[PDB]
Structures are given as structure tokens and as C-alpha cells.
Design an enzyme around this catalytic site. Sequence first.
Site, mmCIF file in Angstrom:
data_model
loop_
_atom_site.group_PDB
_atom_site.id
_atom_site.type_symbol
_atom_site.label_atom_id
_atom_site.label_comp_id
_atom_site.label_asym_id
_atom_site.label_seq_id
_atom_site.Cartn_x
_atom_site.Cartn_y
_atom_site.Cartn_z
ATOM 1 N N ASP A 251 -3.024 1.807 -16.210
ATOM 2 C CA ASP A 251 -2.641 0.508 -15.802
ATOM 3 C C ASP A 251 -2.629 -0.649 -17.052
ATOM 4 O OD1 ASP A 251 -0.550 -1.540 -14.849
ATOM 5 O OD2 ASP A 251 -1.980 -2.298 -13.197
ATOM 6 N N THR B 201 1.825 -0.196 -13.410
ATOM 7 C CA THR B 201 3.124 -1.347 -13.694
ATOM 8 C C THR B 201 4.298 -1.177 -13.760
ATOM 9 O OG1 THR B 201 1.478 -3.188 -13.589
ATOM 10 C CG2 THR B 201 3.058 -4.076 -14.146
ATOM 11 N N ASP C 215 -9.937 -4.985 -15.204
ATOM 12 C CA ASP C 215 -8.241 -4.349 -14.659
ATOM 13 C C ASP C 215 -9.422 -2.895 -14.502
ATOM 14 O OD1 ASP C 215 -6.681 -4.588 -12.146
ATOM 15 O OD2 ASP C 215 -4.861 -4.253 -13.274
ATOM 16 N N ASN D 276 -3.784 -7.190 -19.053
ATOM 17 C CA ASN D 276 -5.037 -6.636 -19.316
ATOM 18 C C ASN D 276 -5.473 -6.478 -19.805
ATOM 19 O OD1 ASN D 276 -4.653 -6.527 -16.564
ATOM 20 N ND2 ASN D 276 -4.163 -4.166 -15.741
ATOM 21 N N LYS E 225 -2.059 -2.335 -20.209
ATOM 22 C CA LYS E 225 -0.747 -3.893 -19.955
ATOM 23 C C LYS E 225 -1.055 -4.359 -20.924
ATOM 24 C CE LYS E 225 -0.383 -5.509 -15.096
ATOM 25 N NZ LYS E 225 0.055 -5.546 -14.017
#
Length: 284
Positions: free
Chosen positions: A130, A170, A148, A135, A132
Site C-alpha cells: 500500500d 489502494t 502503514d 503513507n 502511496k
Amino acid sequence: KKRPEDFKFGKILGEGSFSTVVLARELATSREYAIKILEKRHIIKENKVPYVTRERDVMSRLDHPFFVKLYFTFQDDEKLYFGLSYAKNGELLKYIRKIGSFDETCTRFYTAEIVSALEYLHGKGIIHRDLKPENILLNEDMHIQITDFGTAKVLSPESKQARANSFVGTAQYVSPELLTEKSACKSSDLWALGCIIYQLVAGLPPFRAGNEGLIFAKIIKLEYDFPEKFFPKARDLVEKLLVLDATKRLGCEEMEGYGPLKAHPFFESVTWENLHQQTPPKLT
Ligand SMILES: Nc1ncnc2[nH]cnc12
């Protein structure tokens, strides 16, 4: 061990569906932490125990300057507490939105920090899944602190595991292999990196829509374009990351890992040693 009364809690830093992060000072040491607090009844009722356990297990393995650190955990009857490093400057996403995009020097520097972080993480056999801008936090010195980890995966060394089967991520950053083969690999994070580099330069991630299914359809077709002005060596790098075949992404194990990625021409002026001690370029 510590207990809640060992701390003075200050401002709320974040509120999630099943957690709250609060700034705190430890009385006996005067140190500041971001404390993530989970209500046990809620995590049990909402079947989040595996994600909380995963976050603790993965973070306990990490020791690198570009990751949020887990310093301690404690619990009382109602709550679990994780003592984390405090990233005072918040999310990378905030800076993209405010400035609109990053110049070449800033893109290069922050991309290099992310690459260094991923090299460390993948060298430990961990997939983030995840990655991104929300994060990727920023500390007081404007170095990255990736967070995260409740959806991260420790790949088993005993079985030489390469693929992970849980469906997490995501939409804007999810890899085509997760969508079409239902598994992710370390190279899935390299796809996310490509999205992120694109976003830093262009101002938006490359696969975007108001509905997640519309984004999935573009991902699987490699349906995206570059804006007419995009730094050319960064475009080349993005085109070497946003590759449908996960075994053909620069940085992946089948391509001999991070040495060839670090060798890309976009990074020609990077000094990879002691990056965490270099002064970041100012974001303007
Ligand atoms: N470690 C941290 N520092 C600052 N804000 C946060 N939000 C979540 N974790 C955080």
C-alpha cells in the site's frame, strides 16, 4: 512495560476507522512519540486483529532511517498502544497538493529516498502493498518516514515465498498482477513507485477516475499518458516501472534487484551513501 499515565497526551494527529494517533510526551524521558491507540473491543468486533498483529510484527523487524519506528507497545483493559516515531511534517501528499508538482531536483531526491527504503524492505523479504503519498510521512528534517504496515507481508524465507495472496492496497496504486492473478510480489511495490514518481512530476497519479472499477480497467490495459512537459529521464524511468509483466520492472528480482535501478540515468547525480544525512532540497 509503559502505561498511559507514563505519558502526557497532546494533539490528535490522525483518526482512522479503528485507530487514533495522538502526540505524546513520555514523562520520565521527555521524548515525543506519535502513539497509535486501538480500542480492543472494536478491533475484535470488526475482525481487525490480524491487521494489528501484522503491523506490530512487521514494524518490529524494521530499523532503517526511512521508516516510522515502533519503539514500544503496551495495553490496558480497553486499549492497545503503539509508540511510534513522530513525523512532524505529515504526509508527502500534502506537499504535492500544495505545490502542484515537484521540480526535477526534488523529484529525484524524494524518489531516491523511496528507492532506498524499498531496497531495504525488499532485502528483508517484506512487501509493503500500500505504498502511496499518504503513507510516506516527513520528519522534522524533511526526510521520508514510510508508514502503514498492517497490510504489509513478510514473505517466508523457509519456503522461498515470492507471491502473497491477500487482496489489499489502494486503487490508484494497485498492481495489475494483484487485479488479474490475485497475488502480489515485491515488484508490485515497484509499480506503485512508478505511479508515485509520475504523480510527483505531473501532479496526479497516472490511472485515475471517480470509481475504482474504472481505474482497474485502465491499469490492466496500461492506459495512461504523459503530459507534454515531463522530465525525459523521469519519463524513461516511469516507463521501466509501469510494465504489466512484473518480472520486467527495473528493480525486480528477475532483473537483479536494486543495483540496476539505482544505475538508471535519472539518478546519475545521486549519492546513495548516507542519503538520510543529506540536506533535502527545499520544496517550492
Ligand atoms: N508517526 C506519525 N507521525 C505523525 N503523524 C502520524 N499519523 C500516523 N502516524 C504518524
